[PDB]
Design a protein around this ligand. Structure first.
Ligand SMILES: CCn1cc(NC(=O)C2CCCC2)cn1
Length: 119
């Protein structure tokens, strides 16, 4: 029933993601000095520190907006990868599976709570 519960649930999920070794390439914005053509391919960079900061600033209205930014981290990795077998991209796939498995109940509970609120 709790319309606000998603926020702490997302904070806890981000803490687990930061402890995951697979998140290391995605914890801070992609370094343009190491990947000089990154912005020729990626229009909207995204990373987990930006997501956490957006959440902590009170700049997400719903967990769907946070989930759109997290999915952008993974689609950027897929768009930038030179190969579907590359190390960083392979780490993004595992991390994406872990994120999707945990965010599902957050989204479901929020949407159910909001439908109850508007009943
Ligand atoms: C292949 C594109 N790509 C780069 C990163 N990650 C990085 O640049 C981080 C910046 C700080 C330490 C390493 C993830 N994906």
């Amino acid at each position: 029933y709790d319309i606000q519960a998603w926020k702490k649930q997302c904070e806890e999920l981000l803490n687990l993601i930061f402890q995951c070794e697979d998140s290391e390439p995605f914890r801070q914005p992609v370094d343009l000095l190491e990947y000089p053509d990154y912005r020729d391919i990626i229009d909207t960079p995204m990373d987990f520190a930006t997501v956490r900061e957006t959440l902590e600033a009170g700049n997400y209205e719903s967990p769907m907006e946070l989930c759109k930014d997290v999915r952008l981290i993974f689609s950027n990795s897929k768009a930038y990868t030179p190969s579907k077998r590359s190390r960083i991209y392979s780490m993004s796939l595992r991390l994406s599976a872990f994120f999707e498995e945990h965010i599902s109940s957050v989204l479901s509970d929020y949407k159910s709570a909001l439908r109850f609120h508007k009943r």
